């Protein structure tokens, strides 16, 4: 949950009433959180006249301070009384907190469901065919009459936007096996649950 | 009903089958074979030829010893995949007809194993990779045609990977800036720190 | 009593019904489950279910053992049954019937 | 006493379902329904669904198992043909306990309606498993000299081979090998044709 | 179906008729060394030296029965029809049972060693399964996302191939149910009837 100088600067900053009134705080913690939400942005954040009376150059500092703390608040899954105790440490009032807890609060879930959609992962299967055959004779091998099994998985790879399908043929003793292992799996699961 | 060495899971079929034929044996001549299955488990390794000659005396062919094998290894991995101790096995063993004086000469060398076994099938779990060395090499750039004054620092890393046990370990290489190095084993630390308070 | 329930479980112990070995339940568990195993695996021309649990109440049991005795006579039972006489536990008329079947097994 | 067609233990998925569409209109299943089919030929129709789930105000962990209780329905249902499942023992299996009688017509409608052979022969094409010979060329030569040798006059085959699976195979075929493989083709054939005679007459007695 | 022999296979077996059954047995022994061992002419040469014999119709006969070995073993035909067939090379009675002898007490293990000349597939060797959750990452750092780790291992004409994958348990648990769909057909009527009026 550390911070840097910087950030801390910023939020120095962003308390004083004669740098930022209430109305010029709340459009620019919105601004922060569309710019760090919505995939259509642009400079049009900061193109609202309100905010046209300060230097843009403390004005960014302070946005990016602002979003910082948003992702690392959402990555470390913050609650009120932390964010409430910084703020506090930071020279706050109970405004300012207030509409801060209250516009997190607001769009929490999608910030949580983005952080959640980075990464890679091994092949995730979807389902499962399967054909049963009846295997009869050979070139060399003329008279054997023993069942056989045909599998075929679906599975997506995520470093891949496809389907690539999996096969493989398998015996009545190796298909007894395979359930038998994916059974065991299922139960080591309910297992876990009943704790 | 059921039985908890394999998991409070009805018994299944050919274990019940061959554990009869298992049973057609002699006392002593167990306390050696399961030794060897079990020292086979363990990784010593294993002397098919002996176990031939100690069920050569019962004309066992390849089937009866092929099951008897089957069945030691996984009735005993079974029986240890849920820390079971000798006491209930015994019993549930007698449940499944094997005579008392069998299951006595069995446990006293699976009672007595369990805990180097037990560490053996942690260690040789379910694994994807495995680190098994590292290696670098730090490099001070002083001038280049791009810039002619650098003077600043490079780290080289080469990863060694070992994907299954007698296997080929595949090298990784890779060229580091200091700032990522510096990131790398910021986020390494912190990921060490969220990992050991797990015991 | 029992010294004829060994004879007949050993016989289907052998005779592939390893499941007859168990401990610790009563004869009528194995001995039908053993004979419904029997009936199958010589694979006669069957089209009803047999499925049963060890311990069943009668609620499926006495129909079971209607269907049963529906499809045994259309198998070429050698020797006749009566419905009322299997939950009886009449093992001597037991013991010439299941010749038939466990040599076809 | 009979053995329902969804197997012998119904599956969790059905049996809850079948509180869940007791309150459900006609409608909105219809959708639901109609969804699911179009789901069955590979289609994808997840936009239509989520539409609709936010139309009518629904959690999204009921609209799944509804889903999930159609979907695996319908596929248990459409595997035997009309020959082994007659309309009458598919109501009566049906039975009213935990069901509606207003959405069994629209079961048997979408089931033995003119959709039944799009879903037939979209079905019969999940029976495979190795790929299919998409095209055939070939072109046959007559080597006349060689490097090797001032005349050699030997009849030669080239050939081409095309896959479903994207494969394309280019190779020289000898006249006594194309013999050896039109030979295995044409016992293939036969052998094909016995197993055709034997299915009807081993298995009509 | 019945083993009506070639013309231009049949002239080569005029060796043997002429020959005494003592080395029939011999060669019958060689078309065996021929099938497991492999086959060396230079056996040819110590038959010679040993015997003062022609190599050529030596090799000619040998590989003559074991061709006839082969595909009386690859068709399983009753014994009658053995008999009925080697009828028409003129025999003697001595040396047909003999060669019927010889072609009962080795069709099984023929018929494996046939077996592998089948088209190659995928097949199953064995599964690996393992349960973890994951917990946290450099963007969450408190997360429950539970997973199954798959390793399959599938034998391609005599290779050992692995494919590593990923599943969840609503996932496994339609897997376990349509597999056990699959292996509950063979035991309804339509497989029952298939599988033995043929049979």
Redesign the interface.
Same mark, same amino acid.
């Given at each position: 949950m550390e911070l840097s100088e910087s950030v801390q600067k910023g939020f120095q900053m962003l308390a004083d009433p004669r740098s930022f009134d209430s109305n010029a705080f709340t459009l620019l913690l919105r601004a922060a959180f569309q710019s760090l939400l919505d995939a259509q942005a642009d400079e049009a954040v900061l193109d609202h006249p309100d905010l046209k009376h300060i230097d843009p150059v403390v004005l960014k500092h302070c946005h990016a301070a602002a979003a910082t703390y948003i992702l690392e608040a959402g990555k470390h899954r913050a609650d009120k009384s932390t964010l409430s105790t910084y703020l506090e440490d930071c020279k706050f009032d109970r405004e300012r907190i207030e509409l801060f807890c209250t516009e997190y609060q607001n769009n929490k879930n999608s910030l949580e469901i983005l952080l959640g959609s980075i990464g890679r992962s091994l092949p995730h299967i979807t389902d499962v065919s399967w054909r049963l055959e009846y295997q009869i004779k050979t070139n060399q091998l003329h008279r054997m009459y023993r069942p056989a099994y045909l599998v075929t998985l679906s599975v997506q790879n995520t470093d891949s936007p496809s389907y690539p399908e999996i096969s493989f043929s398998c015996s009545m003793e190796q298909l007894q096996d395979l359930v038998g292992k994916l059974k065991d799996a299922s139960k080591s699961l309910e297992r876990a649950t009943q704790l | *009903?059921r039985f908890r060495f394999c $998991? !409070? &899971?009805d018994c299944? !079929?050919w274990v &019940?089958?061959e554990i009869?034929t298992l049973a057609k044996m002699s006392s002593v001549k167990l306390r050696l074979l399961c030794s060897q299955v079990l020292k086979e488990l363990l990784g010593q390794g294993i002397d098919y030829e002996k176990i031939l000659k100690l069920t050569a005396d019962a004309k066992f062919e390849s089937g009866d010893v092929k099951a008897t094998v089957a069945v030691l290894s996984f009735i005993l991995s079974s029986a240890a995949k849920h820390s079971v101790d000798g006491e209930s096995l015994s019993s549930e063993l +007698? +449940? &499944? $007809?094997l005579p008392k004086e069998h299951a006595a000469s069995l446990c006293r060398c699976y009672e007595e194993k369990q805990s180097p076994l037990q560490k053996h099938l942690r260690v040789c779990? #379910?694994? *994807?990779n495995r680190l098994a060395g590292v290696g670098w090499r730090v490099d001070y750039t002083l001038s280049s045609s791009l810039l002619q004054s650098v003077e600043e620092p490079m780290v080289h890393l080469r990863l060694e990977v070992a994907a299954?046990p007698g296997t080929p370990a595949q090298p990784v290489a890779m060229s580091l800036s200091a700032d990522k190095f510096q990131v790398l084993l910021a986020?390494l630390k912190q990921?060490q720190t #969220?990992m050991s308070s797990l015991g | 009593q029992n010294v004829k329930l060994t004879e007949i479980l050993e016989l289907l112990v052998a005779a592939g019904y390893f499941r007859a070995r168990i401990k610790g339940l009563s004869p009528f568990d194995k001995v039908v489950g053993g004979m419904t195993w029997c009936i199958t695996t010589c694979n006669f021309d069957v089209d009803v279910d047999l499925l049963f649990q060890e311990n069943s109440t009668i609620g499926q049991k006495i129909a079971l053992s209607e269907k049963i005795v529906s499809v045994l006579p259309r198998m070429k039972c050698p020797h006749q049954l009566e419905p009322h006489q299997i939950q009886g536990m009449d093992f001597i008329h037991i013991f010439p019937v299941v010749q038939w079947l466990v040599k076809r097994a | 006493g009979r053995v329902s067609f969804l197997g012998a233990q119904l599956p969790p998925e059905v049996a809850a379902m079948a509180r869940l569409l007791g309150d459900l209109d006609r409608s909105t299943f219809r959708k639901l329904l109609k969804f699911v089919v179009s789901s069955l030929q590979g289609e994808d129709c997840r936009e239509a669904v989520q539409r609709l789930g936010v139309s009518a105000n629904l959690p999204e962990e009921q609209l799944g198992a509804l889903l999930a209780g159609m979907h695996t329905l319908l596929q248990q249902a459409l595997r035997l043909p009309p020959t082994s499942l007659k309309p009458d023992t598919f109501r009566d299996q049906l039975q009213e306990l935990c069901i509606p009688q207003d959405l069994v017509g629209d079961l048997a409608s979408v089931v033995f309606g003119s959709q039944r052979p799009l879903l037939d022969s979209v079905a019969q094409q999940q029976g495979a498993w190795l790929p299919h010979v998409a095209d055939f060329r070939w072109r046959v030569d007559v080597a006349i000299s060689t490097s090797a040798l001032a005349r050699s006059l030997q009849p030669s085959v080239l050939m081409q081979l095309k896959l479903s699976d994207g494969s394309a195979y280019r190779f020289e075929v000898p006249t006594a090998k194309f013999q050896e493989l039109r030979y295995s083709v044409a016992l293939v054939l036969k052998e094909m044709a016995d197993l055709e005679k034997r299915c009807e007459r081993r298995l009509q007695d | 179906m019945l083993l009506e022999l070639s013309e231009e296979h049949k002239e080569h077996l005029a060796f043997l008729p002429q020959v005494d059954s003592a080395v029939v047995a011999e060669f019958g022994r060689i078309a065996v060394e021929f099938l497991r061992r492999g086959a060396n002419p230079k056996i040819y040469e110590g038959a010679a030296r040993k015997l003062n014999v022609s190599s050529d119709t030596v090799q000619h006969g040998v590989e003559g029965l074991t061709y006839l070995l082969t595909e009386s073993s690859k068709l399983m035909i009753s014994e009658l029809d053995f008999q009925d067939s080697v009828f028409v090379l003129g025999f003697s009675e001595e040396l047909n049972k003999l060669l019927l002898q010889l072609y009962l007490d080795n069709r099984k293990e023929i018929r494996t060693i046939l077996s592998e000349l089948a088209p190659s597939l995928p097949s199953y060797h064995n599964l690996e399964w393992r349960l973890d959750v994951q917990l946290a990452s450099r963007s969450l750092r408190q997360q429950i996302k539970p997973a199954v780790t798959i390793k399959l291992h599938l034998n391609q004409n005599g290779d050992h191939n692995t494919k590593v994958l990923q599943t969840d348990p609503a996932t496994l648990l339609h897997l376990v149910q349509q597999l056990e769909q699959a292996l509950e057909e063979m035991k309804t009527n339509h497989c029952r009837r298939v599988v033995r009026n043929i049979k």
């Amino acid at each position: 949950m550390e911070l840097s100088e910087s950030v801390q600067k910023g939020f120095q900053m962003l308390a004083d009433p004669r740098s930022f009134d209430s109305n010029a705080f709340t459009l620019l913690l919105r601004a922060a959180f569309q710019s760090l939400l919505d995939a259509q942005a642009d400079e049009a954040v900061l193109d609202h006249p309100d905010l046209k009376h300060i230097d843009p150059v403390v004005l960014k500092h302070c946005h990016a301070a602002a979003a910082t703390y948003i992702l690392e608040a959402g990555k470390h899954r913050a609650d009120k009384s932390t964010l409430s105790t910084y703020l506090e440490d930071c020279k706050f009032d109970r405004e300012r907190i207030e509409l801060f807890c209250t516009e997190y609060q607001n769009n929490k879930n999608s910030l949580e469901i983005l952080l959640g959609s980075i990464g890679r992962s091994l092949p995730h299967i979807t389902d499962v065919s399967w054909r049963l055959e009846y295997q009869i004779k050979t070139n060399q091998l003329h008279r054997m009459y023993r069942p056989a099994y045909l599998v075929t998985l679906s599975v997506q790879n995520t470093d891949s936007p496809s389907y690539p399908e999996i096969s493989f043929s398998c015996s009545m003793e190796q298909l007894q096996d395979l359930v038998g292992k994916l059974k065991d799996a299922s139960k080591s699961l309910e297992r876990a649950t009943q704790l | *009903m059921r039985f908890r060495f394999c $998991g !409070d &899971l009805d018994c299944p !079929d050919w274990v &019940l089958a061959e554990i009869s034929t298992l049973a057609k044996m002699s006392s002593v001549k167990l306390r050696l074979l399961c030794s060897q299955v079990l020292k086979e488990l363990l990784g010593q390794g294993i002397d098919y030829e002996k176990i031939l000659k100690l069920t050569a005396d019962a004309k066992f062919e390849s089937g009866d010893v092929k099951a008897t094998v089957a069945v030691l290894s996984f009735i005993l991995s079974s029986a240890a995949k849920h820390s079971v101790d000798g006491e209930s096995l015994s019993s549930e063993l +007698q +449940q &499944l $007809g094997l005579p008392k004086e069998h299951a006595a000469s069995l446990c006293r060398c699976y009672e007595e194993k369990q805990s180097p076994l037990q560490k053996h099938l942690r260690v040789c779990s #379910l694994r *994807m990779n495995r680190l098994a060395g590292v290696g670098w090499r730090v490099d001070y750039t002083l001038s280049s045609s791009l810039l002619q004054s650098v003077e600043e620092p490079m780290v080289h890393l080469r990863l060694e990977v070992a994907a299954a046990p007698g296997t080929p370990a595949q090298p990784v290489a890779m060229s580091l800036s200091a700032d990522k190095f510096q990131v790398l084993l910021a986020e390494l630390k912190q990921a060490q720190t #969220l990992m050991s308070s797990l015991g | 009593q029992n010294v004829k329930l060994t004879e007949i479980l050993e016989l289907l112990v052998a005779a592939g019904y390893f499941r007859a070995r168990i401990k610790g339940l009563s004869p009528f568990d194995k001995v039908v489950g053993g004979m419904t195993w029997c009936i199958t695996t010589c694979n006669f021309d069957v089209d009803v279910d047999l499925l049963f649990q060890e311990n069943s109440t009668i609620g499926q049991k006495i129909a079971l053992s209607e269907k049963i005795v529906s499809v045994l006579p259309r198998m070429k039972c050698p020797h006749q049954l009566e419905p009322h006489q299997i939950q009886g536990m009449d093992f001597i008329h037991i013991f010439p019937v299941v010749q038939w079947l466990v040599k076809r097994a | 006493g009979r053995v329902s067609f969804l197997g012998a233990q119904l599956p969790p998925e059905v049996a809850a379902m079948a509180r869940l569409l007791g309150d459900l209109d006609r409608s909105t299943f219809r959708k639901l329904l109609k969804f699911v089919v179009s789901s069955l030929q590979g289609e994808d129709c997840r936009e239509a669904v989520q539409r609709l789930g936010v139309s009518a105000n629904l959690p999204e962990e009921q609209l799944g198992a509804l889903l999930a209780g159609m979907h695996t329905l319908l596929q248990q249902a459409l595997r035997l043909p009309p020959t082994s499942l007659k309309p009458d023992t598919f109501r009566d299996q049906l039975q009213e306990l935990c069901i509606p009688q207003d959405l069994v017509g629209d079961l048997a409608s979408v089931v033995f309606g003119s959709q039944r052979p799009l879903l037939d022969s979209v079905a019969q094409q999940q029976g495979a498993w190795l790929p299919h010979v998409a095209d055939f060329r070939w072109r046959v030569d007559v080597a006349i000299s060689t490097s090797a040798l001032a005349r050699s006059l030997q009849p030669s085959v080239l050939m081409q081979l095309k896959l479903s699976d994207g494969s394309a195979y280019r190779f020289e075929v000898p006249t006594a090998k194309f013999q050896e493989l039109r030979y295995s083709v044409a016992l293939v054939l036969k052998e094909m044709a016995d197993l055709e005679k034997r299915c009807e007459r081993r298995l009509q007695d | 179906m019945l083993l009506e022999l070639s013309e231009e296979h049949k002239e080569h077996l005029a060796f043997l008729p002429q020959v005494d059954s003592a080395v029939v047995a011999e060669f019958g022994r060689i078309a065996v060394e021929f099938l497991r061992r492999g086959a060396n002419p230079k056996i040819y040469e110590g038959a010679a030296r040993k015997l003062n014999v022609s190599s050529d119709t030596v090799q000619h006969g040998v590989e003559g029965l074991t061709y006839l070995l082969t595909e009386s073993s690859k068709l399983m035909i009753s014994e009658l029809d053995f008999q009925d067939s080697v009828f028409v090379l003129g025999f003697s009675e001595e040396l047909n049972k003999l060669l019927l002898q010889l072609y009962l007490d080795n069709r099984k293990e023929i018929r494996t060693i046939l077996s592998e000349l089948a088209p190659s597939l995928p097949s199953y060797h064995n599964l690996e399964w393992r349960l973890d959750v994951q917990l946290a990452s450099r963007s969450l750092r408190q997360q429950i996302k539970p997973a199954v780790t798959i390793k399959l291992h599938l034998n391609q004409n005599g290779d050992h191939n692995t494919k590593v994958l990923q599943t969840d348990p609503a996932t496994l648990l339609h897997l376990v149910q349509q597999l056990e769909q699959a292996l509950e057909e063979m035991k309804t009527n339509h497989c029952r009837r298939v599988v033995r009026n043929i049979k």
